[PDB]
Every structure is written in C-alpha cells, then in structure tokens.
Amino acid sequence: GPGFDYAVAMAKRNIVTATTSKGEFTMLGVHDNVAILPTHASPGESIVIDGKEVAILAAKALADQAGTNLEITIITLKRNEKFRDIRPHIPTQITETNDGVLIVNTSKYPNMYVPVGAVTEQGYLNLGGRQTARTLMYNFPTRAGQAGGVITCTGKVIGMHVGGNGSHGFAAALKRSYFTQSQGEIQWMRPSKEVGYPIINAPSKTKLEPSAFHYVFEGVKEPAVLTKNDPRLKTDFEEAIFSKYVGNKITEVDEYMKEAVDHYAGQLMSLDINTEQMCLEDAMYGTDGLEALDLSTSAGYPYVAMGKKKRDILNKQTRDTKEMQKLLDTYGINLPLVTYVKDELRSKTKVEQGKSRLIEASSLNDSVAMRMAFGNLYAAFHKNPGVITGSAVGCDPDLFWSKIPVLMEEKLFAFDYTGYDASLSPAWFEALKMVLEKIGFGDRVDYIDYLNHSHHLYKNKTYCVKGGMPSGCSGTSIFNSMINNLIIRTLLLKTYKGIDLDHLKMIAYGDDVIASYPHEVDASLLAQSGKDYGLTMTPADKSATFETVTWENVTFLKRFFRADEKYPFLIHPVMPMKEIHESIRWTKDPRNTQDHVRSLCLLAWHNGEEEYNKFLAKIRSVPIGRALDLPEYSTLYDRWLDSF
C-alpha cells in the first residue's frame, strides 16, 4: 500500500526526535527552520535534536478565534538545518481520513507506524486539565509518550498526536494557514549563477549630494538607503526592501469586476482607438501622441551585462531601426527585469525602516516590443487625458487643471493606496486583459501576462514574481491607471449596490485618483470593500479619518486646485511649497542648477505672487542663486494666460 509507503517517505526527511525538559517527542519539521510539537511538551530556550543541543530562536503557542487552545506550538530552530518544505502536504482544512497512519519515533518507540484506521473529527475535547479544539479521533489504544507523532494518509499530513484516553487516540488537526503561506512574497528565488543569468552591478553609494541651497531651505528627506550596511537603518535591509511583494489575494475575476470590465471597456470605445500595431520606427523614435524611447532609463537585460546603452543604439534624426531589429530577432522578448534600488529622496521613517523603492527595468526588447504592440493605445490616452480614458497620464497640469472640475461630477471622493503597484492581484491583470480583449487588443494580451508573471535579476539572485505591476516596464502608468478604473468601478458596484457607473467621473494617474459621482459616496465603506480585492485604502492626503473631499482640499497629482483671482474658471495647480523646498536641497549633477531651479519655479509660482517672490528672494540669498536666470512672477503669470 502507498499510504504506508507515504508515511515512511515523509518521516524519512521531515520527522526527527526532540528532547525537552519533559522527555522525548516525535517532531515534524514543516519548512526551513519551523517545526511543531505538542504544547504540553513545553519547549525551553534550547532543545536536544538527534543527539545534540539546538537553540530556539522563538516559539509560538496556538489558540483559535475563541481563545481556545489548539495544543500546538511552532518553534523555530537556530541553525542552517533546512527541512523539506512540506507545507503543500498539509491540507488547507481540518481533514478526515478513513485510513490514517500514526507516525512516532523516539528511542522508546523507534520507527513506529500504526495503521490507526478511520480518523474522524472529535470537535471539542477535554484532554487532561486543559480543554482543546480542532482535534481528530482515531480508535486505537494510544499509549503515553506517542505525542508529537504525526497522522498521515496517502499524500497528506493531517494531524499531530497530542494524547489519548486508553481506548482512543487524539491529534490536533493540521492546517496550511498555521504557517505563514508561501504564496507571497516571491514565488521562488535562487542564485543567478544556477540559472544561466549573470550578476548585476549596482552603485553602492548614492548620486544625490547637497545642493547649493541645502541651508537656504529646510527639509527632512534624505537619499534612500542603497546598501545593507547603511548605519541609518533600523532593520534588516534585504528583508525590508522585498517586503513590498505581499502575494496574490485573488485569482478569479468575479462578477463585480467583469461588470466593471464591461462598463469601462465600454467607455473606451467612444475614443475609437486605432487597434493596429505601431511600426517599429514610431515605437522607437516617437510619433504623434508618443514620445521616443526614454534614453535616461536602463537598457535592461542583457544590454547592461554587455555594457551597451540605448544611446549607442538610436539615431535620433537618422531614425534607424536595423540596429534594433537585429537585436529583437536575436534576444527575443519576455526577458527578465533588471532590479535596481531607486536612488531618491525618502522620509525619516522610510530610511530607518529600509523601505527603499525598487526599480524593475524591462529589457529594451520588451520595451520596444510593447510600444509596437500598444503604441496606438498609449498615444490615444496621451492625446485624451480625461474622464473617457479615465487617465491623466500625459496631461499638462498648468492647462489640464482648469478642465478637470468641468469634467468631474458634482460630489468628489478619493483615497490613498498603500503599495498599490505590488498589491495588484493577478485577477486584476486578467480583468485588464478582458478590457483590451473588448477594445480590440485581445490579439496581444500575452503582454499583460508578462507584467503579471515576471522574473527579476536582483543582484546576486533571480526570482519570479507572480502578481503585482512592475515599476520599469512600458505602459506601466497607463495599465495601472486602467486597472485603477476597473477597481473604483468594482468597489462602487459592490458597496453601493445598483450604482450607475455612467455617472462615475474619475481620473487616474497610476494609483492616484480623483473621482466623483452625483451622490456623495463613503470612501470608508469602499476602503473596506477594498480589503477583499487585496487593496489597502486609506483617507486622502495621509489624513487621520475619512472625511468629505472638497474642491478646497482634494489633490490630484501632488497638487491642489485653486481658482485664479482674475478668471474664476482658470485653475492653478498648486504644488505645496514644502515639496519644492525638499527637492531643491539636493542634486545629482550640479551642472544643472539652472534647469533644476528653473523647473521648480514653474511649479512654485502657482503658490501666489507673495509666495513665489520669497522663493526667488531665498534662491537669490546665495551666490549660486543670484547668478541664475529665473523668470519673474508676471513673466510667468502673463505667459500662463496665453497658454490656453
């Protein structure tokens, strides 16, 4: 029989003998360094295993939702001893079997395998002094000290022996849950050298240095943490940066999402997007509604390991493709994403807690391939920022801010997401595929699969991520925005049952969304419905409670909305000075103070004439500042009126 043979096979590498201050026990090694044993076997600071001492990093007792004991403790051993990951053998729920086997192994009961027959649920048990729950009953005169032993059946490890009453034997039922699941973070990981890929170099030291205005203005942000030994860290870094991946919350597209899909794909058809493919040249060198390949960003794999930038490939005015074509025929597509730590400014917390953001750069091949595939889709969205596309990607706030309120419905609502790009369950990509599918792109939905399921080359490792939207791929913003559209709809449909999406007016830019409806909706109620779809929603502008969003307090890019005094329907996109002060204090190339400070003024002046003058006054309080060619308020304000 294979049930017996199974019991032996599991035991051969996942069952060991453990000695506590309360005798020998059979112990199931569940995964890595995690093993379980009966609670009454009170684990101490250390423990004797197959001959010698092993320390306990930390132990955990187990109880249920009622507080009732489960009679299971999950200890953690301090050693390089890796158990076979046998979590998958543990059932997801309390399992009964008509032909179970008790596995015990101590110096008192060596290699014991008992055919205990039927294994049914006992429910509530009253085991010596301490009442227990989630137990299984098998009718076999279980003797003392067989505790710890495991109960299996062909292909399943269902219970842990914890006791008996002379006639019967009892075991605490085992469930997958009980061990932090491996469906999140990463799917699998391992040494790049073991799977053909090469090691990725990464600048260790940051390229952000204090600017000429570091003391002129105040600020608290600092360059993000970039290596393991940054003394500013207050936690393990490796662990901290990967804690972004939270793993799939859902797989299936439910009715709400399908109808969210139907409606939004529906809206996109009034746009009459050109469902053709985009020629290589246009995808590369740009066309109407689409800027050429960004030369700043990385070239990705395998172009980084071969030392070859995007500049060395493109002929800006020659507009030559031959070079790029030969590459696409050679290295194909669907290539691993190179992963860098994003070198940027971060808050006091996100430095201490190592929350440095990661860059996953798509290979130039994918990059170009997806532009040929979705180029026309992108151009459509860029030439149409609004409430049809539901996208603000490509907009020009100086001008677009005056249209937004016209486009918006009567009662605004909005909220903040928390690690949006990574919280996107594979179910949302399928939803996204469906939308394409409906607007005449079902032809190349395979590319979304590429975004959902992607392997990354981190530094020393390669790993595959099943879920979440990568950060450095073509279309990222638009696809995130489109996905966002699907989400708001889904949540509205589920919360406010029988809503009317045709009066949903919203605009997204990635995770950022400004929405509206003729009736005031409850952000709170939605944020809850959000949990179910694996999304973490909190009140807009990092606010304490969910409050009513007004035109006086809503913010759409990091900017506010304020009417002009001379023309009540011209709306200034007001960027808070604090953000500008932060940014001006650091620089990655002090040969651009002119372009950098310039760019900031174009944001700062919408703060009012009184404000913007102080700002220049301060820039001009130091030599590098006075020697700068900066626009006066009128020059800008005047130009801004002719803008429209």
Q: Which residues bind a copy of itself (CB under 8 A)?
A: 1-3, 5-6, 8-10, 12, 84-85, 88-89, 91, 98-99, 154-156, 188, 190, 194, 196, 252, 262-267, 269-270, 272, 277, 302, 328-332, 334-335, 388, 434, 437-438, 440, 442-444, 446, 449, 453, 464, 500-502
For residues 182 and 353, which CB has a smaller minimum distance to Zn ion in the complex?
A: 182
Instruction: Of 513, 432, 443, give the one whose Cα is nearest residue 260.
Output: 432
For 130-161, b where at least 16 C-beta lie within 10 A, e where not — what string?
eebbbbbbbebebeeebbbbbbbbeebbbbbb
Q: How far is the CB of 117 from a copy of itself (least distance, A)?
A: 13
For residues 196 and 231, which CB has a smaller minimum distance to a copy of itself in the complex?
A: 196
For residues 433 and 606, which CB has a smaller minimum distance to Zn ion in the complex?
A: 433
- Report in angstroms the alpha-carbon separations of 568 from 354, 559, 565, 572: 45, 18, 6, 10
For residues 181 and 543, which CB has a smaller minimum distance to Zn ion in the complex?
A: 181
Instruction: Of 124, 122, 160, give the one whose Cα is nearest residue 139.
Output: 122
Q: How far is the CB of 381 from Zn ion (least distance, A)?
A: 24
Question: 32 is in the binding site of which of a copy of itself, Zn ion, none (Cβ under 5 to 8 A by kind)?
Answer: none
Instruction: Of 480, 479, 454, 450, give the one whose Cα is nearest residue 466.
Output: 454
Q: How far is CA 284 from the centre of its chain?
A: 29
In single-letter form, the type of residue at position 226 comes to L
Q: What is the DSSP letter of 357?
A: P
- Report in angstroms the alpha-carbon separations of 620 from 361, 576, 583: 39, 20, 17
- Give the x/- contact pattern for Zn ion in 391-430, rule: CB under 5 A: ----------------------------------------
Q: How far is the CB of 198 from a copy of itself (least distance, A)?
A: 9
Tokens of residue 601, six digits? 């003024």
Q: Which residues contact 235 (CB under 8 A, 6 or more apart)?
A: 352, 353, 354
Q: Segment contacting Zn ion (CB under 5 A): 203-211, 248-256, 459-467, 522-530? A: 459-467
Q: Using alpha carbons only, give the angle 543, 549, 551 rounded to the nearest 5 degrees.
A: 120
Binding Zn ion by CB under 5 A: which of 446, 500, 547, 595? 446
Q: Segment contacting Zn ion (CB under 5 A): 87-95, 303-311, 440-448, 598-606? A: 440-448
Question: 269 is in the binding site of which of Zn ion, a copy of itself, none (Cβ under 5 to 8 A by kind)?
Answer: a copy of itself
- Report in angstroms the alpha-carbon separations of 30 from 4, 81, 300, 507, 508: 20, 12, 38, 48, 44
Q: Which H or E element spans position 598?
A: helix 593-604
For residues 165 and 183, which CB has a smaller minimum distance to a copy of itself in the complex?
A: 183
Question: 48 is in the binding site of which of a copy of itself, Zn ion, none (Cβ under 5 to 8 A by kind)?
Answer: none
Q: Which residues contact 326 (CB under 8 A, 6 or more apart)?
A: none
| Phi and psi at residue 247, to the nearest 5° | 65, 140
For residues 76 and 187, which CB has a smaller minimum distance to Zn ion in the complex?
A: 187
* DSSP of 72-120: EEEEEE-SS--B---GGGS-SS---EEEEEEEE-SSSSTTEEEEEEEEE
Question: 6 is in the binding site of which of Zn ion, a copy of itself, none (Cβ under 5 to 8 A by kind)?
Answer: a copy of itself
Are 11 and 105 in contact, with CB atoms under 8 Å apart? yes
For residues 466 and 588, which CB has a smaller minimum distance to a copy of itself in the complex?
A: 466
Q: Segment contacting Zn ion (CB under 5 A): 286-294, 322-330, 346-354, 443-451? A: 443-451
35 DSSP β-pair partners: 29, 75
The yes or no reply on residue 195 touching Zn ion (CB under 5 A) is no
Question: 480 is in the binding site of which of a copy of itself, Zn ion, none (Cβ under 5 to 8 A by kind)?
Answer: none
Q: How far is the CB of 153 from a copy of itself (least distance, A)?
A: 8
For residues 25 and 245, which CB has a smaller minimum distance to a copy of itself in the complex?
A: 245
Question: 191 is in the binding site of which of a copy of itself, Zn ion, none (Cβ under 5 to 8 A by kind)?
Answer: none
Q: Segment contacting Zn ion (CB under 5 A): 63-71, 387-395, 464-472, 494-502? A: 464-472
12 burial (CB, 10 Å; 0-12 / 13-18 / 19+) is exposed
For residues 38 and 470, which CB has a smaller minimum distance to Zn ion in the complex?
A: 470
Ranges of H-type helices in 353-475: 364-382, 397-407, 420-423, 426-436, 446-452
Question: 10 is in the binding site of which of a copy of itself, Zn ion, none (Cβ under 5 to 8 A by kind)?
Answer: a copy of itself
Instruction: Of 280, 351, 347, 292, give the one whose Cα is nearest residue 317.
Output: 292
Q: How far is the CB of 519 from Zn ion (least distance, A)?
A: 43
Q: Using alpha carbons only, give the angle 570, 576, 579 rounded to the nearest 5 degrees.
A: 140
Are 256 and 495 in contact, with CB atoms under 8 Å apart? no
For residues 91 and 472, which CB has a smaller minimum distance to a copy of itself in the complex?
A: 91
The yes or no reply on residue 121 touching Zn ion (CB under 5 A) is no
The yes or no reply on residue 464 touching Zn ion (CB under 5 A) is yes
For residues 263 and 382, which CB has a smaller minimum distance to a copy of itself in the complex?
A: 263
Q: How far is the CB of 155 from a copy of itself (least distance, A)?
A: 2
Q: How far is the CB of 617 from a copy of itself (least distance, A)?
A: 49
Position closest to Zn ion via CB: 464
Spatial distance between the Cα atoms of 227 and 241, rounded to a whole number of angstroms: 11
Q: How far is the CB of 507 from a copy of itself (least distance, A)?
A: 14
**Residues of this chain that bind Zn ion (CB under 5 A):** 446, 464
